[PDB]
Design a protein around this ligand. Structure first.
Ligand code: DAO
Ligand code: DAO
Lengths: 252, 61, 277, 178, 252, 277, 61
C-alpha cells in the first residue's frame, strides 16, 4: 500500500496512512553545494541533524469561509531551534526543505486544499500606489491569510484569493511544486523542495526564497453534529543546510 | 584430575583470565550454579504469532 | 557471549516503510529500535545481560523460615523445631519464585543457628558448646514428639549434627518433585469432587524438618533460633507471569486485598520542575 | 483511578485543544509511578542499574471513523518540561497519524552521558520527559463518540539490560505468614 | 625559529613571535568519540568550524599586587557564538579546546605567570561550615580572582592563592597541563587540552570539566615611566565539538 | 623488568651542547641526568620501581569506616549499623585515592567485627558465640528499620553471616561505577540549574551497608564494633594531582582552612651544623 | 589444571624462583592483585610538548 509512508529527518519522524505519493521539487532532490558551483571561499558549516529536522509551525483552523493562508521561508523558521540560530550568526545560507501539510477530517466531511510552493513569490500591495511592509509579507511562524474579497490596508498585501496576491490566476498555481488535500482521499501533502535560486547561496532574512500557500478550492463542509474544528498543521524540515560568513548574531 | 578450565567474567582491568574447576562429589546436585548459560529466545513472548510480521511493514493489510 | 544488540547507523528516510506503525491487537510486541524512527550513529554495545540470567537471578541464598526452641523443659516452651517445608512464609523469595508458574532445579540449603541465654537475676553458668541436630523427614516418616524421641536415631532420614562456633551447616538436594517441575501455582483441587484443598498445598509436599539441642539440659533456660536458607541452582523456569501486586496475606493461598495499580500523582500531565536556577 | 481501568485510559477529545498537553511524565522505568509497576519496571526493581532504549506503543481505541494526528515528543534532561508544542517539537518526537494501523511506536533512544543509569534515578542520572500534544485534532462524523481512549504500552528494546541485583521495594511483611 | 608560531581554527587565526612550544594535554590530541566508546545512540551533530574557533574572553589587568585569576569551562563560553547555542539546545557535549593566554610587556618589565588547566577543579568554600554557590565558582567570561589573603564570604570560594582554593600547594599545580609566561622570554602560552572526563560525554552547564588558572609566581614589576598597564587576555577554541540530545533551549 | 636507568660513564666536555640550559616556560620537565653536568662512572643500576606501581601502592587494606551497635534494646542505643558507603571519612585512604582524579578497579572488602560486655556490678553471663550479619543494599533497595525487619531476609541483596572467633569475613566486588571510572573529584552539580549537591556526593552512590547481631537478645547489654576495610586491586588511575595540603574538614566536600605551604625555619640560608667535634 | 607458573620477586639470596597460580573463582574480580605490571611512560607529564625537545639543545631558538 503506497497510502502509508514514513519520513525520518534528524530526531523527528512523521507518519501517514493516507498520503498521495510525494512531489519532489522540479524533479530534483536537495543536495549540498558542489565545488564547481561554490563562490564563498570559507569552509561552510553543516549542522546536519541539528538543523535538518521537522519543525512544526502554529496550526491553523479551516473554516467554511476560509480563503487561504501563506508562509514565507526560510524567514518563518527564524526562531526554530538551531536552524534559526545559524540564520542569525551567518551571512549566507542554503537549504532544501521537506514541506508536510497535515489535515484530517472524516468520510463525512468534504473539502480540497491546494498545497503549493511558489519560488520568489513577490507579492503586491493593497493600495497599488503604495508599497508593502515586511511585517505584512511574513510574520514568523504566524500565518498570513487570504481574503475572499479585496483588501484596503496601507502597506498590506492584496489578500484577495483569486489573484493569489501576485496578480495572476489561482488556477494556474499548479505550475509550481504542489499537491492537493482532497479529504475524501487525502490526509496530508508532502513536497520536497530543492534549493531554487539564481545564486549558489543567499541571506535568509533579507530574501524569502519561496512561499507556501494553502488555498482551498473546495469549501470545507459537513452536516450537524460533525466535528466543526478542522485544523491544518504545517511541518517543514531543512535539507542539506549549509552556512557561510560567520559573524555576530543579527539583532531582529 | 578431571579438571575443566573455563573463562572468567571480564575484570576491571581489561581492554590469564580463566579459572579451573573439578567436581569432588558424585551427585550433579552438588556442583556449583550454572552462572554462565547465556541462551535467549524472546520470540516465545514478544512474537508468538503464526504469521511472521516484518517490522518495516503494516501489521494488518 | 550474552552481549546486547548494537545500534546500526541510520540516516534520513522517506519511503513506504512503516516500522513505527503496527497493531498490538495481534498480540505481537513491536520489535522497533531507535535506528528505525530517527537518525542514529553506529555504537558497538558491549553491555551484557549476564546478570539477568534466571540462574544468576534465583541462585542466591534467601531466608525461607525461622523458629525458636529452648533447652530446658520449663513452662510450655517448645524444646524442638518442626516445619512443613515450603517457601511461602517469606514474601521476598516467594515473590521471585512466583514470577514463573513452573520451576525445576537442585538446591543448596544453609542453616544459620544462633543461641542465647534468657535474662535472669542469678544466671552464672559454664555450658560447653551447644550441638544441634537438624533432621529431614520426607512425607510418611515417623515424627518425633519429644527431644528424646526414637525418631532422632536418624536411621535412614538425612540429618545434620552441628556445633556452634563452626561455619553454618550446608548441604545440597536434587529435584525432589514427583512431577516434571515444581509448581508455584495450582488452579485445581486435591479431591476430584472439586473440594478440599485448593492451590499449592493441594499437591506440594516436601516433607518436614525438625531441629533440637543434642545436649541433655542447661542449668538455666536458653533458646536457639534456626534460620533456613534456600539457594536454587541448575535452574529452569517456565511460563512467566505478572509479579505480585497485593501484599501476601496467607501462606496457603493467594488471598489478597484490592490493591492500587500504582502510586498516585497530581495529574496525567504532572512532572516535577527540577530546574530552578 | 488507582483501582480502576481508568488508570490506563488516556482520553482524547474532538474540538480545538491546541496548546493543551494531553499527558506527560518522567523517564524513570523503575522509579516513575507510571512505569514503576509495568512488567518492565517491575523487573528493573530487582536491579539497581539499567541501560537501553524503551518502546512506548500507543493504540487508538476510538471508532473506525475517528481520525487525528498526535505529536509524541521526548525531551532529554537539561531544560524545563515543554510548556508548548513548539518546545516539545524541538526534541525527539513522533507524529502519529491514526488510521488502519491502530498502534504507533515512540522509541525513546538511550541518550545518556553514562553507560548505565540507576533504577532509583536521581537528578544526576535524569532521563528526561515525554509529552504528548495534538498535531492537528480529532475530527469525527455525526453520531460518533467525541471522547476516545488511547492505551499506552511500554517495553525494553534489544539494546536494554539491567545490572545490579537488589531486592524489590514492593513487597514486605511484619511477621511469618500462616 | 620555533619562537614564532601560527594557529588556525575556523575563521580565526592567532599569531605569535615569542612562544615556548605547545603543551598537548596529557600527550593526547582532541578527537571525536569513537563507536566503540559511544553511549548516546542518536547521531551527534558536529558544527565544526561553526563552534571550533577562537573565542576571546574579557581581558584582565595584571598589577603589582595581583594574586591570580581563574575561569571554568565550558561554562565560561555559554554566551560565545554558536558554541554556546549548542550548549543550550543539547543535553550532552564533548570538546577539546586550545587555550591561548596572551600577555606582552617589554625587556624592561618582569614577572612570571603560571597558565594551568585543572581537570575537575573542585573548589572549597570560604566558610568551611557552609557551601559554595555556582555564581561564585564561575560567572561567564568574567574571571574570578585569587586573593593574597584569606576570604570570608558566606558562599564564596577560598580565594587565598597559596592553596589555589583546593586545599593544596600552588607549587604542585605543575602536575597539570601547563606553561609559564616569563616576560623576559615569553609573550604567551598555549595548551591543547583533550576531552578529559570519566564519561564519553556530559552536560556542559551542570559540569565544569576543567578550570584555567593564571597564577603569578614572579610579581609584575618595572621602573618609572614604564607602561603600568599590562593586560592578560585569554583565548580558547573548542576542538572536535560533538553534541547529543537535541531539545528545547535551556533557560539560563 | 621495572629496572632503573643506569648511569653512562661521562668524561670532560667543551662544546655547544647545552643539556643544563633550558626553559620551563614550555611546560617541559628537564630530562637531564648526572652524566650530563659532570664526569660520571659507569654504574649498572639494578634498583627497581616495582613498589612504586599504582597497583602495589593502592592495593593494601585500609580502614574506611567504623560503627558500634548493641545487642539489648535498652535506652536509645542503635542495635544495628547503617552506612552510606564511601571512602571520605578516613583521611588516610582518602588522601591516597585523591592523588588521582579518576579510578577504576575491583576491590577486596574485609570486615573486622569485635564485641564486648558493657561494665556493670552484676553481669555474670554465659552467652553462646555471637553471629553477625552484614547486608549490602544497592541504591533503591528496601532499608531495614529494626533488627527484625523483613529486609534482613536477604532475598537478592548480597549478605554475609559470620560468627566470632573465625577469620574476619571477606569478599570481592567488581567495578560498580555506572561510569567508565570512579570519580574522586566532580567540579559540577547534581541539578542542571547549577545547584543542589556539589562535588563527589553529586554523582557517587555505592548504596548502603547494614549490620546486626542475628542473636535474639543478650542477658546484659553488649556492643560490637565493625570496621570496614577496602583493598583495591586490578587498579587503573588517571590524571594525577597535588596531594591534600589542608586537613580534611567535611566528608562531603573539599572545604579547608588556609594552611601553610610547609614548615618554617630561621632563614633561606639556614642549615643546622651537625658537625661539632 | 589451568595452572600458570610465573616468576617470583628476587630474594635475599640471589646473585626454583617461580610460583604457581590457579584461579578457582568464576569472576575475574576474585583474582589476586596484579603486583607485577611494570609499565611506564612519564612522557605524558614530563614532556607533553608538541615539538620534541632535544636535551643537548636550547629549549628556545
Ligand atoms: C533435606 C531438606 C529437604 C528440603 C526440601 C525443600 C524443597 C523445596 C521445594 C520448593 C518448591 C517450590 O518452591 O515450589
Ligand atoms: C558489597 C559491598 C559493596 C561496597 C561498594 C564499595 C564501592 C567503593 C567505591 C569507591 C569510590 C571512590 O573511592 O571514588
Amino acid at each position: 500500500s503506497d497510502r502509508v509512508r514514513s519520513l525520518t529527518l534528524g530526531n523527528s519522524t512523521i507518519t501517514t496512512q493516507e498520503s498521495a505519493n510525494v512531489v519532489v521539487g522540479y524533479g530534483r532532490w536537495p543536495e549540498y553545494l558542489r565545488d564547481d558551483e561554490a563562490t564563498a571561499e570559507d569552509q561552510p558549516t553543516q549542522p546536519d541533524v541539528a538543523t535538518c529536522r521537522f519543525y512544526t509551525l502554529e496550526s491553523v483552523q479551516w473554516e467554511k469561509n476560509s480563503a487561504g493562508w501563506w508562509w514565507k521561508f526560510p524567514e518563518a523558521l527564524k526562531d526554530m531551534g538551531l536552524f534559526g540560530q545559524n540564520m542569525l550568526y551567518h551571512y549566507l545560507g542554503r537549504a532544501g526543505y521537506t514541506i508536510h501539510v497535515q489535515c484530517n477530517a472524516s468520510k463525512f466531511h468534504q473539502g480540497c486544499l491546494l498545497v503549493v510552493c511558489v519560488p520568489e513569490a513577490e507579492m503586491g500591495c493593497s493600495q497599488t500606489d503604495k508599497e508593502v511592509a515586511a511585517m505584512n509579507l511574513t510574520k514568523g511562524e504566524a500565518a498570513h491569510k487570504f481574503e475572499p474579497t479585496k483588501t484596503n490596508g496601507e502597506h498590506t498585501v492584496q489578500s484577495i484569493v483569486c489573484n493569489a496576491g501576485m496578480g495572476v490566476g489561482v488556477g494556474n498555481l499548479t505550475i509550481y511544486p504542489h499537491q492537493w488535500i482532497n479529504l475524501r482521499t487525502n490526509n496530508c501533502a508532502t513536497i520536497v523542495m530543492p534549493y531554487v535560486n539564481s545564486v549558489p547561496m543567499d541571506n535568509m532574512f533579507r530574501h524569502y526564497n519561496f512561499t507556501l500557500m494553502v488555498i482551498p478550492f473546495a469549501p470545507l463542509d459537513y452536516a450537524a453534529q460533525a466535528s466543526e474544528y478542522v485544523p491544518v498543521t504545517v511541518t517543514i524540515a531543512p535539507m542539506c543546510a549549509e552556512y557561510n560568513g560567520l559573524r555576530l548574531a543579527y539583532q531582529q | 584430575m578431571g579438571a575443566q578450565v573455563s573463562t572468567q567474567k571480564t575484570g576491571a582491568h581489561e581492554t590469564i583470565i580463566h579459572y579451573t574447576n573439578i567436581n569432588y562429589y558424585k551427585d550433579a546436585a552438588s556442583n556449583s550454579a550454572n552462572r554462565q548459560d547465556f541462551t535467549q529466545d524472546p520470540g516465545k513472548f514478544t512474537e508468538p504469532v503464526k504469521d511472521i510480521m516484518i517490522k518495516t511493514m503494516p501489521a494488518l493489510n | 557471549i550474552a552481549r546486547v544488540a548494537d545500534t546500526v547507523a541510520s540516516g534520513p528516510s522517506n519511503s513506504t516503510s512503516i516500522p513505527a506503525l503496527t497493531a498490538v491487537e495481534t498480540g505481537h510486541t513491536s520489535q522497533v529500535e531507535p535506528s528505525d524512527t530517527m537518525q542514529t550513529r553506529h555504537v558497538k554495545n558491549y553491555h551484557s545481560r549476564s546478570e539477568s540470567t534466571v540462574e544468576n537471578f534465583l541462585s542466591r541464598s534467601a531466608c525461607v523460615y525461622i523458629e525458636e526452641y529452648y533447652t530446658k523443659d520449663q513452662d510450655n516452651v517448645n524444646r524442638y523445631m518442626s516445619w512443613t517445608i515450603n517457601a511461602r512464609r517469606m514474601v521476598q523469595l516467594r515473590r521471585k519464585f512466583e514470577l514463573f508458574t513452573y520451576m525445576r532445579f537442585d538446591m543448596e540449603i544453609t542453616f544459620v543457628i544462633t543461641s542465647r541465654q534468657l535474662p535472669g537475676t542469678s544466671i552464672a553458668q559454664d555450658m560447653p558448646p551447644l550441638t544441634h541436630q537438624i533432621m529431614y523427614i520426607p512425607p510418611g516418616g515417623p515424627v518425633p514428639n519429644s527431644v528424646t524421641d526414637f525418631a532422632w536415631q536418624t536411621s535412614t532420614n538425612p540429618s545434620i549434627f552441628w556445633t556452634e562456633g563452626n561455619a553454618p551447616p550446608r548441604m545440597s538436594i536434587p529435584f525432589i518433585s514427583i512431577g516434571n517441575a515444581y509448581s508455584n501455582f495450582y488452579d485445581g483441587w486435591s479431591h476430584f469432587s472439586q473440594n478440599g484443598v485448593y492451590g499449592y498445598n493441594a499437591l506440594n509436599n516436601m516433607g518436614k524438618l525438625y531441629a533440637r539441642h543434642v545436649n541433655k539440659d542447661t542449668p538455666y533456660q536458653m533458646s536457639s533460633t534456626i534460620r533456613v536458607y534456600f539457594k536454587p541452582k541448575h535452574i529452569r523456569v517456565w511460563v512467566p507471569r505478572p509479579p505480585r501486586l497485593s501484599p501476601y496475606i496467607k501462606s496457603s493461598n493467594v488471598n489478597f486485598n484490592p490493591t492500587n495499580l500504582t502510586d498516585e500523582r497530581s495529574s496525567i500531565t504532572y512532572v516535577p520542575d527540577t530546574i530552578r536556577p | 483511578n488507582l483501582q480502576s481501568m481508568d488508570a490506563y485510559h488516556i482520553e482524547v477529545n474532538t474540538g480545538n485543544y491546541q496548546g493543551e498537553k494531553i499527558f506527560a511524565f518522567q523517564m524513570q522505568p523503575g522509579l516513575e509511578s507510571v512505569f514503576k509497576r509495568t512488567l518492565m519496571g517491575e523487573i528493573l526493581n530487582y536491579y539497581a542499574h539499567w541501560s537501553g532504549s524503551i518502546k512506548l506503543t500507543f493504540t487508538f481505541c476510538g471508532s473506525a471513523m475517528a481520525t487525528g494526528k498526535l505529536l509524541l515528543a521526548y525531551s532529554p534532561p537539561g531544560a524545563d518540561v515543554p510548556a508548548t508544542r513548539k518546545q516539545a517539537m524541538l526534541g525527539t518526537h513522533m507524529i502519529w497519524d491514526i488510521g488502519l494501523q491502530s498502534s504507533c511506536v515512540l522509541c525513546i533512544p538511550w541518550i545518556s552521558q553514562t553507560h548505565y543509569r540507576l533504577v532509583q534515578q536521581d537528578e544526576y542520572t535524569s532521563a528526561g520527559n515525554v509529552t504528548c500534544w495534538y498535531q492537528t485534532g480529532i475530527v469525527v462524523p455525526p453520531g460518533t463518540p467525541n471522547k476516545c481512549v488511547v492505551l499506552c504500552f511500554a517495553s525494553a528494546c534489544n539494546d536494554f539490560s539491567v545490572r545490579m541485583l537488589r531486592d524489590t521495594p514492593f513487597i514486605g511483611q511484619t511477621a511469618l505468614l500462616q
